[PDB]
Symmetry: D3
Subunit: 117 residues, 6 copies
């Protein structure tokens, strides 16, 4: 089975980077529905897992994540990063969970293609 | 007297940027006890107002904000930026609050200096 | 009145950087319609002056620039940056125009505040 | 053989990332004359496709793309991105073309490697 | 045996980029000792090879680079980047040498995965 | 006398940011031969003070710094930033010296305008 891992570093709404990331993932999912795709969000991107994002503009990062964690795409947030920005205890989007660098390593060594945004 | 406005745009911990502005601001206030100094956090930097910050390394953005909002230094988080990332309702640092673009234009115009970090 | 000069450096849509500089720009002129407010675009921001901008969603940088040039807010694109990107000869947003660094070093020397984004 | 996809988010000249992507791209080909190389440009790196780039300074992104397109290395510009910047209807450098996320999300699935700069 | 190349571009301490890049490399090495792991630094990352870093804060990039070269991991700094920055002839960390984009093209061609933080 | 301060954050060569700071400072230094212009470099911009920068490309940041120092323009490198990179003990440029935050707070306090890139 093809195993893809996308790791995002960009902060939500400030970097078009995080936005493109979730767009690729959502796209990759449809093309090859049977694809083992996982997501690890580092540094700034970690705040993306917060509930209640109410964008007035256009795209909604919470919505894009829910589209993924509804089709069963693992979405993890770096522990040290969420702990520093105080998001570990706050309400996170559904299929979004806290993860570690070690698991991220595991995914990396196990993946066939690792894309970094 | 002297009216100085500081505008941070960068995400907490992601880069030294927000850290420098807060670092400069504390330095300004420690050089002039009654300097009318106001902080305004936009875009990515709006997440710094979060309360549960617990880094475990070097600098603590929450702590730096508390050193500023205790010397009665206003610190505003841009309403739309907070509404976008779901921060408008969560617990924010002590004297940290939610302001509007109208307020920053209001500040800017009546200010002697406007350091835009 | 009061001379204020805004200087954007970020690429359009790539980051809130140039978007915020325009929101702040438009907002300043609403508080005071007399403001001798001037806009200068450097490097990557230079492409914002192009015509034909039709954003899939979210904000539209062209309109914002048009809403400024309509009030007569001088918007100048740096000559060197435009040449290297091939924006000089192409159709510009309106009462956008190609300016120079020598012009910036002047607005700066005669301004009251220089808001740098 | 081998399929290598290269993605780029960086704005020409303002950043270094885009320049590096192309330098590495031209290098990969020089190593393997037959290397199946595909270049996708998202967000900001999309203005890099404009014709008439003539910087009096250092590198010339236009030339680096012609070096790659002369070899028939496909270079696709993201549709949604180009539309937002009003570059869709402008004259693009030869081999440069307007592609879609759907395509990137396909090249990715059928590639041994994907470098994302 | 696995061939994994990690490329980094972010200046040290300035962003988390280069930091999480080395952190992930150290964790990958701790996972599988017999992993063919290569480190290549371009642009601003090139200055991380400098000896004598004395950060009084938290993470120390020099120590992270030494922990890697200790486990016999190659670490080459881009030659053209180092020349223009004045680093090509300064004291470098223990196992850090100057490399070439030609060497990076070789690495990427024979690598199973190429991570680009 | 007009007192202007330029605070730079960008890494040399990795971005145009630092470049424009120096260029706009040299511009300011020529139009007003009798102005008090001061330069402070924080973060990644700090390594711009090293000697021996021989870029084979375009602009040479060492030269731009010499043209300013030659004109008695104070160039200070943040002390803690230079400690972390190990530049505090390395050979610095002609008139480039190591400075502190406290000093910057003072420059900002006695300045008419402060430009930050």
């Amino acid at each position: 089975m093809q195993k893809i891992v996308i790791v995002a570093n960009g902060a939500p709404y400030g970097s078009e980077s995080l936005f493109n990331s979730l767009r690729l993932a959502i796209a990759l999912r449809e093309q090859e529905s049977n694809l083992d795709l996982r997501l690890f969000l580092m540094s700034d991107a970690v705040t993306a897992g917060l509930r209640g994002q109410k964008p007035g503009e256009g795209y909604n990062i919470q919505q894009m994540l829910e589209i993924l964690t509804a089709q069963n795409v693992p979405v993890k947030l770096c522990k040290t990063c969420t702990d520093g920005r105080g998001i570990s205890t706050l309400p996170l989007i559904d299929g979004v969970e806290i993860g570690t660098l070690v698991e991220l390593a595991q995914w990396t060594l196990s993946a066939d293609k690792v894309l970094t945004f």
